[PDB]
Amino acid sequence: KRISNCVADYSVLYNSASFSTFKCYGVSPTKLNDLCFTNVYADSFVIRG
Amino acid sequence: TPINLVRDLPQGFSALEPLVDLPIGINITRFQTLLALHRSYLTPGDSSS
Numbered sequence: 392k393r394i395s396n397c398v399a400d401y402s403v404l405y406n407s408a409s410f411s412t413f414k415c416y417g418v419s420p421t422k423l424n425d426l427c428f429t430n431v432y433a434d435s436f437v438i439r440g
Numbered sequence: 441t442p443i444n445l446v447r448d449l450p451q452g453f454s455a456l457e458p459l460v461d462l463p464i465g466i467n468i469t470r471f472q473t474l475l476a477l478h479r480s481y482l483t484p485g486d487s488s489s
């Protein structure tokens with residue numbers, strides 16, 4: 392997936408209270424929204440437990 | 441831009457303003473336009489002749 396020319400907030404992508412696991416390295420989860428980047432790529436697939 | 445003419449476009453000046461931006465990120469080398477036809481009671485209704 393490729394996202395460009397869009398302003399989105401991740402807060403609603405976190406307050407669902409339904410994700411079993413969460414992992415994010417390199418940047419703090421609470422201060423990545425302010426940190427501006429160029430493009431965001433989504434790597435969606437399925438996997439076993 | 442409204443006009444009352446068939447062919448041989450007028451010499452008047454009119455600028456063009458953007459409406460929306462599309463950030464595909466992929467080069468394009470060919471294009472093609474689409475047209476809509478009508479199927480009235482005069483035609484048999486088949487798209488052959």
Ligand SMILES: *[C@@H]1O[C@H](CO)[C@@H](O)[C@H](O)[C@H]1NC(C)=O
Pocket residue numbers: 467
């Ligand atoms: C143009 O498109 C082709 C086909 O996808 C691709 O292989 C090529 O790298 C593209 N060129 C540029 C400059 O993006």
